[PDB]
Design a protein around this ligand. Sequence first.
Ligand SMILES: Cc1cc2nc3c(=O)[nH]c(=O)nc-3n(C[C@H](O)[C@H](O)[C@H](O)COP(=O)(O)OP(=O)(O)OC[C@H]3O[C@@H](n4cnc5c(N)ncnc54)[C@H](O)[C@@H]3O)c2cc1C
Ligand SMILES: Cc1cc2nc3c(=O)[nH]c(=O)nc-3n(C[C@H](O)[C@H](O)[C@H](O)COP(=O)(O)OP(=O)(O)OC[C@H]3O[C@@H](n4cnc5c(N)ncnc54)[C@H](O)[C@@H]3O)c2cc1C
Lengths: 482, 482, 482, 479
Amino acid sequence: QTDVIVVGNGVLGLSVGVEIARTRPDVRVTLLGKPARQYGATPAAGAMLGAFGEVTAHALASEHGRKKHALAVQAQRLWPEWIESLEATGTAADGRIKTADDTVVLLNTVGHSALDDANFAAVLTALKEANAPHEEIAVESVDWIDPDPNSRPLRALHIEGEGSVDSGILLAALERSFLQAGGRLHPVDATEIRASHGRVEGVVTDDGDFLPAGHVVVAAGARSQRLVAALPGLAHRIPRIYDGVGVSALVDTWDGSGPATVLRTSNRAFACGLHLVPRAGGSVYIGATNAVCLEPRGAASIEETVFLFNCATHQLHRGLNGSELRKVQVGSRPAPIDGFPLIGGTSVEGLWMLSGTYRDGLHMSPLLARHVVSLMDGGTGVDGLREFRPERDLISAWSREEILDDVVRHTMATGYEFPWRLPLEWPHMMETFLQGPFAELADRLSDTYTPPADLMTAIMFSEREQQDELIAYYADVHREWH
Amino acid sequence: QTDVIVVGNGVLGLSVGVEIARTRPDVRVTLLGKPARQYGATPAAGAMLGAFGEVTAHALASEHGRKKHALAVQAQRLWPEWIESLEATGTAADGRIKTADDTVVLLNTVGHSALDDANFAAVLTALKEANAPHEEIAVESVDWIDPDPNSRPLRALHIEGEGSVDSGILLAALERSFLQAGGRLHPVDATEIRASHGRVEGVVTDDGDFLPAGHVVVAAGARSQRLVAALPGLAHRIPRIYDGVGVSALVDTWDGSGPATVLRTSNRAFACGLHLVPRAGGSVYIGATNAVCLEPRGAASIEETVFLFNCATHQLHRGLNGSELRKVQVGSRPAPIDGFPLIGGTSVEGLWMLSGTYRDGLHMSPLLARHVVSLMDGGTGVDGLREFRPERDLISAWSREEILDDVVRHTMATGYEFPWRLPLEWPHMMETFLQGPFAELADRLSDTYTPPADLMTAIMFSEREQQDELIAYYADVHREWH
Amino acid sequence: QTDVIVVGNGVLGLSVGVEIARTRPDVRVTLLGKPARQYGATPAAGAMLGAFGEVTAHALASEHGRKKHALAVQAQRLWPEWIESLEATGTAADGRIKTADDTVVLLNTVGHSALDDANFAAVLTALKEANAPHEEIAVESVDWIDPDPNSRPLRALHIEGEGSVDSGILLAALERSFLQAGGRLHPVDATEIRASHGRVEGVVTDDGDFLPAGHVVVAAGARSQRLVAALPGLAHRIPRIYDGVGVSALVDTWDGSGPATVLRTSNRAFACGLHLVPRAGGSVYIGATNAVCLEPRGAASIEETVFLFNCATHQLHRGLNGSELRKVQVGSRPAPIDGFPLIGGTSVEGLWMLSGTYRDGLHMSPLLARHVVSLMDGGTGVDGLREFRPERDLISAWSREEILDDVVRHTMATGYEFPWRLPLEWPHMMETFLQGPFAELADRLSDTYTPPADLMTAIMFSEREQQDELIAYYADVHREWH
Amino acid sequence: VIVVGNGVLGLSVGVEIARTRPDVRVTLLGKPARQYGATPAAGAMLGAFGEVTAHALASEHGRKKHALAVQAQRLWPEWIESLEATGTAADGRIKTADDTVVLLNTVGHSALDDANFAAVLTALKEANAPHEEIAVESVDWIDPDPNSRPLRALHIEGEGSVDSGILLAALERSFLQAGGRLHPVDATEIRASHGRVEGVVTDDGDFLPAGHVVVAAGARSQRLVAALPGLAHRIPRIYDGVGVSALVDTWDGSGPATVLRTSNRAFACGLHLVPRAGGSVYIGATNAVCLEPRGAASIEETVFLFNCATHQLHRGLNGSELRKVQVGSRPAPIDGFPLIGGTSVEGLWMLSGTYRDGLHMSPLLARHVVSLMDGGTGVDGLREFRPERDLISAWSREEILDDVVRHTMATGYEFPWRLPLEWPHMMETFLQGPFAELADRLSDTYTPPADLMTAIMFSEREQQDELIAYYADVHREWH
Ligand SMILES: Cc1cc2nc3c(=O)[nH]c(=O)nc-3n(C[C@H](O)[C@H](O)[C@H](O)COP(=O)(O)OP(=O)(O)OC[C@H]3O[C@@H](n4cnc5c(N)ncnc54)[C@H](O)[C@@H]3O)c2cc1C
Ligand SMILES: Cc1cc2nc3c(=O)[nH]c(=O)nc-3n(C[C@H](O)[C@H](O)[C@H](O)COP(=O)(O)OP(=O)(O)OC[C@H]3O[C@@H](n4cnc5c(N)ncnc54)[C@H](O)[C@@H]3O)c2cc1C
């Protein structure tokens, strides 16, 4: 066929669906996925259009991290016209995609100096280097916030033109825009990709049906690699994607108020972070925890809920303490095993992947969609995304030594972010006794590959059988590529 | 036949519905209320069959409190045959009403000595006085629990034959038993009770309909007095009932385990308390917060959720920290303004009330149902419930001095239960500076009536307009009865 | 006679002794006081030459506070030449008076935003207004410090030419310089000043002797008003001075290191503050608590010791935790009842006072000495000391409303500086319930006079008999002056 | 006879020798400063049943030590009578309390505090000692933080306390009355040849001749005897168990009628208040084994002691005046048991390594050594504790490794810390490996007790290497 099947109904599937439908009016594009959006990252997102706010010293210390940052800055420029084009297919009563134009980054001491102080400096540096509009402002001038004095910020940074969207209104606008462009929504899941003679034939659905296609775009979030890995040789040629389980909440504020801007800290222990995204109608979004899990999980832990609420009520606004909990949200950030996204073509003709975007696939969605659509039309898409081709040896963006320093520092940061109260000698003792066991795990996993810190901590506290399976995986990948 | 309308589909409405339908073949009985059970206490309950566990030194210091306790002990004896009679109308696949036969009461130091130490002694005394089977056990012998050592119990009390039911399975069994007995469920709300010539005519429903009846039983939980107060003179003759908003949660335990018994503390600050009720299928119930509100609220505050989770994870089982949150539940304990229930007949022929049961209407339900059904058949029901007739001057069960000591002590207990960490001189200072403002409020509200501590704290932190309205209410009640 | 007696052997007595001896070589100057220096402020001082570091928003909001600040800035200019003139009478082996040239002010969140944030801004403003050399610096550039990350500074201010002296080496240098200039040390205490026909005759000593003099300078620290108040009418014409009991400690650092600068916060709750003053030979000085006491006290409380050690180990250097405690020091800051010093002449010819200097008598010593010596020579001394003449109606430097806001804010600051951990609603409740009792005390004490916050808190927690005695004192002062 | 050392043990044996051998000259060495002195820093509790731990009573050597403590308690009333008899009313009273209350709170590890409270109750019942578990509400005087309050309390009848300062004064006075001579210098060297003591070189250069030398020099005792031939690897090393205590003038001049204490806690730390005359209370006491002596409190020790006392015993102590921070060295034997009795050198005796309870055992230990010196057999239970011995192995390496991880965790729970709930289990798992590795590296046969193992873990690599050599030289000497 010249038929296109998009597998997945998150921001990436729907965004690529809209761009394919709009630019290929002569082709049938069908998008698979259910309204439940099981383990769905996009519906649990605030979401911040995070570029400069997402800067960490650790990310900007690697070439791959600097490349990722450049793409985030490029994506930000597409959002105004993208939103215009999505709202155009609706009416006033569909509501507004954009919920804030600006972001304030707060620096408080409820965290590790080695992360929060380094990350605040790295954000300031990245803004100056980009000539991006921003101002360090007096904390007293930040409107709305009412923190616990012992948890209060002492520095604040206003980032102009870095805002937020309502992820629910965005998903609704994308579905409507997809239909307007001639797309068809088929609310079932793909169970199997069918291929022979090095080319896609189509997709078996979970209602037993077979849908034929010349093109299949896998944008199934954390399920994307598990779906393609069934095809011959692809188990050790497409980097694994795990579930970065994240917890967020919708809160009806005590007085119906909200901040005019996004409020956030820099990224914290293991890509956790504290932020408040404005919503319409006396609701605010607060987020968001992160924990890499080797198996999917669709419910918040008690610990995640308490940590998120404690951070927001102390560090942002004590008024949230008396505010009503409307919804606890859980979704899976697609967490690539080598720390970088899986975007583009495959050794199978007509098979494409758009996944592994972790914290910022929603922000990058208009750029990533346009890239894959350019590739499908025989173009070269966006310069700088070829490094992130899905069929690849695992990337080694950092030394084993760098990752081992990072994992101990992030482990300690879970304490300082609580925040704990310990005898003053205990942290130094814990630091010294964490180094050995993480060095031992890293050496045991593989002679060539080291999992990034966020994955290494999950592997450290997984079962021995799960660690053994990963040792086998890394060995089979080394065999395939070397 | 002579029609009966039961207004309300909680435990009390359904329990009286079942008893009327089963004992009165001459009556058509119709029960009003919606499946949503808005503000419903019963669905948010664990629930503990609380008699001896509910004992406090303060309750047993008043004649009215001792009378209430006696009824709780009598109700416990009805439960085995009551459950038998409800399960008999179903099949194995409907599930079991009883989830535990026994209770363990734990004493830890995450609370005020003036409440927890006095209440533990009062429970021991009440058990010995009743010749009830119990024993003080070694904490090491309490199975399953895994508390934070700094939050651990140092004393434990096993109460034999004081257990728990699944409130959801009880409600299902009551509805099924009601239908089997010839009852009719009409899923609408009463908006108005119609009366003329000193007699009930029936009920206007919220779909505009009028249902005629010779008998109307109001068991609408926290809405019960607001519904009858519209009838002539009844605004100052039926004590007000407020919303004792309570938060509980269902948790899927990390390993599917649960305790074999109820685990609880004694009642704590303002009729808050910590307990875990076993459930079938790897779930546990944890509860339960309490806050008297002058207006209803159907969502948990952030503060209530954090406090409940923090108490359960530290004081009962650290494993709950990594367990999955299934559901946050919110319901309104009917909180009578004078601290005692509203049970029996009215100055309006055929108008009955079953409400204001606060923490233990579910436990007392089989006894309370049988009492009201006996009264409706011209009997005298249960000895000792006449004091709790719904049409009455406000009861004064305590001196103003007693309530003022209680409210300061319970306020301080909110600190010790957190638990806070303060400079050692601060608690004595706070105690001294709380006395004056509560004495001033009590003196300003009325020359004769004092709200019980749980209501006094809610009034202290209500708006000036709400305090003024209550001053007018107490003055109009004094006028009516004196 | 033309003989001069200086009563008191602290920094002020010895400083004025040195200036009199050096400028009047034809006159006999005798200095009284014993080597033990009971309750002595000077030996317990670090000491910081505190001018800009002592700035608070509250002080600079009053005309009297702006006058005090101007004098501190004038005194700072005298110190380099004053030290040169004192070291000139000794040799290298006598040790160096100056222990640091510069001060770093740190801003952390272990305190009340309403004090620490306002005071940091006030220091920056006062430095710019004075054209003083200073720089806001990166916290990472502050050498030596190793705080708890949860207690770490996020802003830092370098003040050039605001340093510290070794108070012990200063006292030794002053005694040596006094003897070199012809001064005589008589190690007894004055019991009585003798005066008749409106002129001083001399001093009765505690060994029964009488020393004649034409001039008596009272610099007896917290005992100075008690000594002059015995003269006719002077009991209600010389403002009372109380004991500002302060605790400091000498610590031998784990590795013999110390910072190159003074390290301090701004002044905190009730003129407490955290600072570390470098010393020679592997010692550091840490201070300093403050409590106004209605009677003198010569030993640290447990609370004062714990608070000082906890602040220093968390906020400055965790290495101090493992460091050896050499000495806990206690001295009495002369605390004037109206909040301002007693400097200059009297209605008695030849009677002078130099006292009530509270936190900065040592810093102001060279200026205060020169002022009194100018007055004794028939000059007008230093411009801006006239409001601080010792024979005066009590100053009212603030409105009762200003002091009431200050005392509640400083009370709350004792919590945030601990730092406490409380439920988020508790601080607002405590703030509301503190206002009434302090307003009631202020209204009861006097219709015209209000004690400054530091004294008001001591009176609030004193016995009813001590409050009654103060009501009588204020009434007798009003009678004398109105 | 020369007694080397002027602590409770030296003076107690001095008094017993002087009183029972009136025909002999007994001279006692030591200076008024009592540098690193344990006795002056002691409360002191006459600790027998209060000193019981589950871990101590699980070993034969620990049960033997406990039996001696119970025997010593019976000697105290007549011993005090005999010391006060040499003075007047104005010298003050040695005894400050007759009874002890043991409090159980949750400011500690369940694995220590809960096990130790049960072990105390059991040891009291087994001994037929008078005691009763009492309502916490019936404990007079105490005013704890409610979050730090006890929920169980135990009254121990006839287990009390003495004023260590008044005891030392009474011992010196009683020594002089009995014909003893005080020579305020330190021994630098014991002189011996032909397998017999000749006497002592003092630090002022003098030589004092003697037929008997009793070494009771606290934590310095083994270092002094180790200089004699072969004795470096035949007398177990003694280290400094540095302890911090404080004298506090109470806000209202009040005090409790009894000793107030918890059971022993992390690494033989413990919280107690000992009554004193004149509106003073003693609070103690920290413990840290140090490989070199230390004569000043750390900031951490002072804060921990004050924080424990103000929260767990009486909030009134917060506003009370600090009179004195005291520091002394508990003689900490490397194998965990005392060094009492005779030597392979004729006329050389040792009384040391008593750690937490040398003062309590002093009248029994004095009488034992005096019996031995007179050709008797002294007290039946003391033979295992002879000073010239292979290092005792009272516990398995596995037992000590469980203990050291549990005591490390207890330092957290006693603070008390506030941590994420997953952190303690993680720390427990990551402590096991490094302590197992240290124990295996130190020796194939000897394991230091937990209190010493933690000090070795955090010592310099050179100090660990020196201990590996010491253990190897001891193994060589005895096997
Ligand atoms: C708590 C949280 C907060 C976040 N905050 C932000 C933020 O502030 N800014 C930001 O830019 N991003 C944010 N993100 C999202 C992040 O950018 C993600 O990388 C992004 O949403 C990924 O989108 P996706 O379309 O790849 O995956 P998803 O959004 O997970 O979409 C995948 C969809 O495919 C479906 N699917 C799965 N298997 C199949 C199958 N076999 N067949 C068909 N359908 C299938 C799933 O059910 C799901 O609906 C957040 C995410 C989380 C969890
Ligand atoms: C968190 C929590 C924990 C609890 N734990 C326990 C426990 O362990 N043990 C125990 O014994 N009890 C427990 N209780 C419950 C307590 O006993 C209550 O007193 C009891 O459930 C009250 O029963 P009810 O039927 O009067 O009220 P509800 O259960 O509130 O029932 C009233 C019903 O009437 C409906 N209604 C309201 N207005 C109208 C109208 N106009 N027309 C028709 N229907 C209307 C409501 O929607 C509701 O469904 C708990 C309650 C809470 C909130």
